[PDB]
Design a protein around this ligand. Structure first.
Ligand code: HEC
Ligand code: HEC
Ligand code: HEC
Ligand code: HEC
Ligand SMILES: [Ca+2]
Ligand SMILES: [Ca+2]
Ligand SMILES: [Ca+2]
Ligand SMILES: [Ca+2]
Ligand SMILES: [Ca+2]
Ligand SMILES: [Ca+2]
Ligand SMILES: [Cl-]
Ligand SMILES: [Mg+2]
Ligand SMILES: [Zn+2]
Lengths: 314, 768, 352
């Protein structure tokens, strides 16, 4: 016969989501500059709005299609239309998001708007997505606030790679010395301590680490140049469609807001455009300018591997 | 009930489900609105559809219970096209008042009070619908904008009544069938621009009606008529579009069901325009969508201009041949104006023998069911039941209307002309693979003249269509070229079905087949992919348009990305040529005026014109309308023929190119010269829509003339069985320079017209 | 209980998963926000108890006899062993990061646990007699989401959902050997949520999404950003990998997650979490399409947005967030676990 619903077993208590109400205008979305007072009663509604694909135009995808559903990230690299075309952005890891404003990737440099870059509020991130990404109806004030409440309520998972005793390993301990070495200088933009739960390992500032993707003729030129040296040596296709990450790009800015190093084990494909395929690549001076991110040139492999292991421990 | 998706409770629907919420919010139907028309050719001119002004008609309210009928329009000379508001307490319609003013858009309460005029236009207006944009809930919304570099602040409030989408035509214009109307879709601000000000932060740009407190903006630029707009479940506008461009669809054209955004940012086909589909040249009008099974149900008329006919249906979710149905569907009468209810019932206007009435539809019996109301003295159609309509979602708009864009960064409205200093509104478009197509190799202009791979397509020609406007009735004649390829659709301007056109410009194509360009906005246009000789391999026959500041993407050349197929994942070079600069809206190159070749006449590069005029990093070219180049046979081609051809080609040596610009009388009509008539002459056993003896309109590479001028086999389509004579052969490739030869190429690819300058001009032509 | 990834408390169970006893008398629901497992009698559709487990269970598997329930506690990085008759947890075995799924061998002597941690590649094996973790089988890449065991029980497939990867694959394991024999890549895939075997063991179905990553984000139409797909892989050596659409032109199935295979292989059942509905497909039309088409034709057919209607049996309304589905052994009933609505939808199938 024809498949049909005969009955529904209610195991737990009944729960219904927030209504449609009145959708915000884009100026109304930009009108929210700073966060609203946190409400823990709206967090589940926010989780629903986060995972729901029915609110979208034809039901193609949801937030969780990108930031995944444990609220972390899929590592998918996209080209968004407010930062310029050919400028790629790695999908943001959303655990512990409230602890380090401003938001997105691009920082204060080149961004007086504080919307696309140096985003002042999480509201200006998600509230924008219906019109600038999903291309669907805008959120109501309530649903947006609930969504932001869900995002702010996300906490770090913590690293699996440390002893059940809770302590570190001697490889990680070995790497910690390289990390905190004043010559290497990771602590400058990434201040923090491994045993400190409140450690964000970020200065929450905008720096030039030499990760800015430019053209063959330099900044604001076209086409892009291969920033991956190992991939250039490998003879990889710049315009290849099979690559997990782009080896080229054109950035509208040279400087970026520093991300947390917490749960960095779980971010697929680091930096902003996802230029760095492994943790090692954030160090070895392949996908960035020489010694512009830390001074690692004098280090060699065992040290670098230890440093990677310590990064895995955060 | 849940329809598209599951709801919060069993048997209940989510607010995101339009169909289901429509089912839950409908309510009992008591009263209905419908149009009564005088029974006359002048009283019910459905043969002139979309241009339908049923003079003497009225709008009436009927009670399904008390059986009492009331005439609400008594103050109007003509009234029709009723559409109810969301609450069902008021409705909008089209009509002309006894006081005059022409056919316009009005709205009135359901009781018959509170009349308001929504449009004062030079032209005729039709079929208004409500689109709630920024108004979901009843009340006042707040207006907010940025301080011009300050903060975002509140200024004032506005009553949220939403917008009005309607179809309308200007005065003294002709479509591609030479009918004296051209219809297009307009969005209307009910509050006088302040709804658009609430959504955007600037009032609507367009034509303002301050006396009516309204403003209109043209969202669709098609050269033929776009009519009968309706609502999609996902919040877009569903309507019927006439695709007549040139010789396409057997020189007939098709009326397609398609959708677009309420600002006209993303037009795409739904069903009926593509080869292999069902209905042929049948007219498709008055389309609506069912709530239960989600069926697009439309009137399929046997004649393209008819508004009465049978009823057909295709799935909205999957608009393909597999889901096509003929609802009614045989015996024996005519159907019109179907109206699906959320409860799955339907109201149709049915005539068993010859006279229409309101009837419930029966899906089991595939015909009209029980009778609602019929007067014998009136033709009863356009049933519009009174119930509560669920508002579809409103989509964000990046244009404030004419000349106005809205930035993707700050979302701040800006005038491209008055402020930024550009001569005209300009958008962009990008194709990721121009070689990628679902079309085979074939003789027809919309097909490939030869196989092309990446690197074979050097550039693209971008063409703008010119509306046919002929104030002087003595200097223009339809059917002047009936002996030529054009047939009935020919005219004093052209011996082909192609109306007057001009070249927007050329743009280079990357080695991967991708291309991107900046060009004019709010103008009808299309493109052609070019080989290394600069000839069109394939033509896109349709009218594209760009709203200001809007980009438009496509995977391929009629590949299915905008029709039946998912976007192909492609990493394209053109993507990086689009917007790379912080200080720019777009960094993409503007369309170049010319092309440059080598010794042989092979493609070398693109060449700037003198039309070149800090929000873009590239030279701004081709935005000046008065400077836009075209190819006229009299001004450009004919002198070349007189100089290097006519001497050797006379009556004894066909084709006969002699006589200069002197007109030749054919069937008592003097339109073109001798050379034009000769070159446009048809060939036995060849479809005129493909071409004639020496000329194939909108394919130069298939034209025998070009084949001889290059003395080579250019395409995979042979013009005839014997091309080059065995004896007496004379090589023609050295007779012309590259300029003249490619001028002929451009002339043919443009559709091989005669008069490419719109309106009466000084150059020779039809006169009486 | 806590909402996943948060310190915020909720009273709602939030079912993340569902399964059924091989005798079909009992349903076991893993409550993610309840940190427990709900027992339901199939015949009375009544809650017969709630058994406490460790933090955030996302999965469970029943022993062939039905005396035990192995539950995957994701946050606890562990696996609980539950006595079904006693309604009590008798042990906790410790495994790798975030077990997202578990399955018992046909002989019931071994349980396989997929460790889904983003930097973790492991499938941990557990002896049922020792009730202990024997060793670990290292996959080809990170993040196995779920495993599945073939009807002959000599092979173990694992979907690898790998963060930061466009090409996400499936590993084939030889159970007697305990090593990777082959790795098959599903091109342009993301978010692999499940894998199931056909009763004859000649095919596997995998639900996932197809991003277009290399394209600008502009419109939502024609699946310009995401399309939703189910992939059928032929288990024979050199077999076809067929990526097939779940979407209509204007109607898409958001985030397909859970799968249930008809006992005779007649139908496929797919929990659609984003669109809150169960998509039922005809497997003989699907497999018929696979057998009669080349790889090229299938690859072209992946983007056909009218193709589904050929093999689509139904789309059935469900509660909010149907993350998991399961079938009765007779295949006449399909149950769907709804997280947000905190309930289970019971569906009468086409089987009669
Ligand atoms: C000016 C550039 C032109 C154009 C546009 C054409 N001609 Fe000629 N032509 C000449 C002779 C002796 C022939 C017949 C022998 C042969 O075809 O080689 C032609 C033929 C043509 C054709 C083909 C017509 C057909 O096959 O039906 C065409 C389309 C054509 N011509 C166009 C001679 C001369 C000549 C010297 C007397 C010159 C000068 C031209 N032609 C010039 C032109
Ligand atoms: C200031 C100049 C910095 C110094 C010194 C170090 N880091 Fe950093 N880090 C900085 C920026 C501006 C960025 C982002 C740049 C971009 O293009 O996105 C980063 C990023 C990282 C990351 C990846 C984070 C992520 O992708 O989410 C890692 C793992 C990292 N940095 C580690 C790291 C190490 C090991 C350093 C010492 C050699 C170090 N950082 C120094 C800013 C700065
Ligand atoms: C190669 C020429 C192109 C390119 C670069 C584009 N299109 Fe499409 N187009 C094309 C053909 C052969 C046809 C059909 C012609 C005929 O006589 O039938 C079309 C038609 C359209 C339509 C009409 C609806 C339809 O036929 O599907 C639309 C709408 C349309 N084209 C849009 C469009 C878009 C968005 C493009 C991306 C820039 C695009 N065209 C490029 C061939 C070609
Ligand atoms: C709510 C909600 C969020 N997401 Fe978004 N996301 C995506 C990208 C490519 C980026 C980075 C953009 C840039 O760097 O310029 C982001 C960023 C975020 C952030 C910022 C987190 C931070 O620590 O700064 C938040 C909070 C966020 N996003 C929330 C990619 C995507 C998607 C793929 C197209 C989609 C569907 C998506 N994000 C959806 C959503 C949300 C639903 C409205
Ligand atoms: Ca971008
Ligand atoms: Ca930050
Ligand atoms: Ca990342
Ligand atoms: Ca009648
Ligand atoms: Ca003229
Ligand atoms: Ca863990
Ligand atoms: Cl396409
Ligand atoms: Mg759009
Ligand atoms: Zn077409």
């Amino acid at each position: 016969g024809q498949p049909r619903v005969i009955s529904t077993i209610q195991t737990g208590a009944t729960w219904e989501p927030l209504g449609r109400e009145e959708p915000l205008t884009v100026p109304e979305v930009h009108f929210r500059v700073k966060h609203s007072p946190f409400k823990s009663e709206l967090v589940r509604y926010g989780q629903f709005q986060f995972n729901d694909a029915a609110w979208s135009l034809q039901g193609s995808y949801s937030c969780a299609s990108c930031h995944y559903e444990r609220g972390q990230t899929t590592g998918l690299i996209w080209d968004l239309g407010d930062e310029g075309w050919g400028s790629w952005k790695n999908t943001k890891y959303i655990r512990g998001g409230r602890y380090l404003p401003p938001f997105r990737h691009e920082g204060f440099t080149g961004h007086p708007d504080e919307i696309v870059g140096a985003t002042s509020s999480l509201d200006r991130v998600c509230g924008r997505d219906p019109g600038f990404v999903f291309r669907s109806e805008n959120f109501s004030p309530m649903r947006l606030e609930a969504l932001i409440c869900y995002i702010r309520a996300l906490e770090f998972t913590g690293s699996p790679f440390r002893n059940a005793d809770g302590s570190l390993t001697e490889a990680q301990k070995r790497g910690q010395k390289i990390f905190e070495d004043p010559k290497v200088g990771c602590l400058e933009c990434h201040p923090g301590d491994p045993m400190d739960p409140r450690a964000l390992f970020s200065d929450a500032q905008t720096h030039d680490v030499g990760t800015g993707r430019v053209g063959v003729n330099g900044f604001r030129s076209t086409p892009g140049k291969v920033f991956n040296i190992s991939a250039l040596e490998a003879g990889e296709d710049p315009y290849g469609v099979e690559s997990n990450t782009p080896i080229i790009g054109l950035d509208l800015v040279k400087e970026f807001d520093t991300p947390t190093l917490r749960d960095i084990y779980a971010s697929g494909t680091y930096f902003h455009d996802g230029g760095a395929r492994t943790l090692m690549d954030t160090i070895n001076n392949t996908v960035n300018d020489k010694d512009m991110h830390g001074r690692t040139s004098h280090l060699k492999q065992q040290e670098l591997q230890d440093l990677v292991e310590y990064l895995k421990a955060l | 009930e849940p329809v598209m998706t599951g709801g919060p409770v069993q048997g209940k629907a989510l607010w995101t489900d339009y169909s289901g919420m429509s089912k839950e919010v409908q309510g009992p139907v008591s009263q209905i609105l419908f149009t009564q028309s005088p029974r006359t050719a002048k009283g019910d001119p459905y043969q002139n559809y979309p241009h339908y002004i049923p003079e003497g008609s009225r709008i009436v309210l009927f009670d399904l219970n008390t059986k009492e009928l009331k005439v609400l329009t008594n103050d109007f000379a003509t009234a029709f096209d009723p559409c109810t508001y969301w609450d069902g307490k008021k409705f909008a319609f089209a009509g002309v008042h006894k006081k005059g003013g022409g056919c316009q858009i009005w709205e009135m309460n359901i009781d018959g009070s509170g009349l308001r005029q929504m449009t004062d236009l030079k032209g005729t207006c039709r079929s208004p619908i409500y689109y709630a944009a920024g108004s979901i809930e009843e009340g006042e919304g707040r207006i907010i904008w940025r301080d011009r570099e300050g903060d975002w602040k509140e200024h004032g409030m506005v009553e949220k009544t939403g917008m009005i989408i309607f179809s309308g035509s200007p005065e003294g214009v002709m479509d591609e069938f030479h009918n004296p109307y051209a219809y297009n879709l307009y969005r209307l601000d009910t509050q006088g621009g302040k709804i658009i000000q609430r959504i955007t932060g600037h009032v609507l740009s367009g034509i303002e009606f301050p006396h009516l407190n309204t403003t209109i903006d043209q969202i669709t630029y098609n050269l033929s008529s776009n009519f009968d707009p309706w609502l999609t479940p996902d919040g877009n506008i569903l309507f019927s579009s006439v695709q007549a461009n040139g010789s396409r669809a057997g020189g007939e054209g098709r009326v397609m069901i398609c959708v677009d955004n309420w600002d006209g940012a993303y037009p795409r086909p739904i069903y009926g325009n593509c080869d292999g589909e069902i209905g042929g040249t049948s007219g498709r009008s008055q389309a609506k969508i069912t709530f239960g099974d989600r069926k697009i149900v439309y009137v399929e008329s046997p004649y393209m201009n008819w508004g009465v006919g049978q009823l057909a249906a295709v799935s909205w979710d999957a608009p393909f041949n597999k889901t096509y149905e003929k609802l009614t569907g045989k015996d024996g009468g005519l159907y019109r104006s179907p109206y699906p209810l959320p409860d799955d019932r339907m109201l149709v206007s049915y005539a068993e023998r010859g006279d229409f009435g309101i009837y419930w539809f029966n899906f089991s019996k595939c015909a009209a069911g029980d009778k609602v109301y019929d007067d014998p003295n009136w033709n009863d159609h356009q049933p519009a039941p009174v119930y509560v309509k669920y508002k579809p979602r409103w989509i964000n708009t990046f244009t404030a209307g004419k000349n106005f864009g809205v930035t993707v960064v700050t979302y701040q409205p800006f005038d491209q002309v008055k402020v930024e200093g550009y001569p005209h509104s300009w958008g962009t478009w990008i194709c990721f693979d121009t070689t990628l197509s679902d079309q085979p190799v074939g003789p027809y202009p919309h097909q490939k003249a030869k196989n092309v791979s990446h690197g074979d397509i050097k550039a693209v020609r971008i063409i703008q269509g010119y509306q046919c406007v002929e104030p002087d009735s003595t200097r223009f004649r339809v059917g002047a070229g009936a002996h030529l390829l054009g047939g009935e659709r020919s005219s004093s301007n052209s011996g082909t079905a192609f109306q007057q056109r001009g070249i927007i410009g050329y743009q280079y194509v990357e080695s991967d087949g991708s291309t991107v360009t900046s060009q004019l906005s709010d103008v009808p246009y299309y493109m052609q992919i070019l080989d290394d000789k600069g000839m069109s391999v394939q033509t896109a026959l349709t009218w594209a348009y760009l709203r200001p500041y809007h980009g438009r993407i496509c995977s391929g050349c009629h590949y299915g990305s905008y029709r039946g197929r998912a976007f192909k994942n492609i990493h394209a070079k053109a993507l990086y040529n689009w917007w790379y600069d912080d200080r720019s809206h777009y960094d993409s190159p503007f369309a170049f005026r010319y092309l440059k070749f080598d010794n042989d006449g092979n493609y070398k590069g693109v060449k700037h014109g003198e039309d070149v005029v800090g929000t873009t990093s590239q030279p701004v070219e081709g935005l000046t309308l008065d400077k836009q180049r075209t190819v006229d046979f009299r001004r450009d081609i004919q002198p070349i023929l007189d100089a290097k051809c006519a001497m050797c080609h006379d009556s004894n040596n066909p084709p006969n190119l002699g006589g200069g610009l002197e007109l030749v009388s054919v069937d008592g009509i003097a339109a073109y010269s001798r050379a034009y008539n000769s070159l446009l002459e048809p060939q036995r056993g060849k479809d005129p829509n493909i071409g004639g003896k020496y000329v194939n309109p909108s394919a130069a590479i298939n034209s025998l003339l070009v084949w001889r001028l290059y003395e080579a086999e250019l395409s995979a389509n042979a013009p005839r069985e014997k091309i080059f004579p065995i004896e007496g052969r004379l090589l023609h490739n050295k007779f012309l320079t590259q300029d003249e030869r490619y001028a002929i190429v451009e002339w043919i690819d443009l559709g091989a017209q005669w008069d490419n300058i719109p309106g009466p001009d000084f150059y020779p032509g039809y006169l009486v | 209980g806590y909402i996943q990834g948060t310190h915020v408390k909720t009273d709602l169970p939030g079912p993340f998963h569902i399964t059924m006893s091989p005798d079909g008398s009992t349903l076991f629901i893993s409550n993610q926000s309840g940190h427990s497992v709900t027992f339901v009698d199939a015949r009375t559709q009544k809650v017969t108890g709630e058994v406490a487990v460790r933090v955030q269970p996302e999965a469970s598997a029943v022993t062939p006899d039905g005396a035990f329930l192995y539950v995957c506690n994701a946050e606890s990085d562990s696996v609980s062993v539950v006595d079904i008759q006693r309604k009590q947890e008798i042990k906790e075995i410790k495994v790798g990061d975030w077990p997202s799924g578990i399955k018992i061998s046909p002989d019931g002597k071994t349980a396989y646990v997929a460790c889904s941690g983003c930097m973790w590649n492991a499938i941990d094996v557990i002896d049922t007699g020792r009730m202990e973790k024997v060793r670990s089988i290292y996959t080809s890449d990170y993040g196995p989401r779920m495993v599945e065991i073939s009807p002959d029980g000599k092979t173990l497939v694992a979907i690898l959902d790998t963060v930061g990867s466009i090409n996400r694959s499936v590993d084939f394991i030889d159970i007697a050997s305990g090593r990777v024999v082959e790795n098959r890549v599903i091109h342009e895939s993301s978010n692999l949520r499940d894998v199931v075997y056909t009763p004859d063991g000649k095919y596997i179905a995998v639900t996932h999404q197809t991003p277009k990553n290399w394209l600008p984000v502009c419109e939502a139409e024609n699946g310009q950003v995401f399309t939703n797909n189910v992939t059928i892989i032929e288990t024979k050596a050199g077999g076809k990998v067929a990526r097939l659409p779940l979407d209509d032109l204007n109607n898409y199935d958001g985030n397909p997650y859970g799968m249930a295979m008809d006992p005779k292989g007649k139908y496929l059942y797919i929990g659609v979490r984003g669109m809150h509905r169960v998509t039922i497909l005809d497997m003989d039309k699907v497999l018929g399409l696979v057998r009669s088409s080349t790889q090229e034709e299938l690859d072209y057919l992946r983007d056909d947005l009218g193709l589904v209607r050929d093999y689509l049996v139904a789309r059935v309304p469900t509660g909010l967030g149907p993350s998991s589905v399961c079938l009765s052994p007779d295949g006449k009933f399909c149950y769907a676990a709804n997280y947000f609505s905190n309930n289970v939808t019971v569906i009468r199938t086409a089987v009669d």
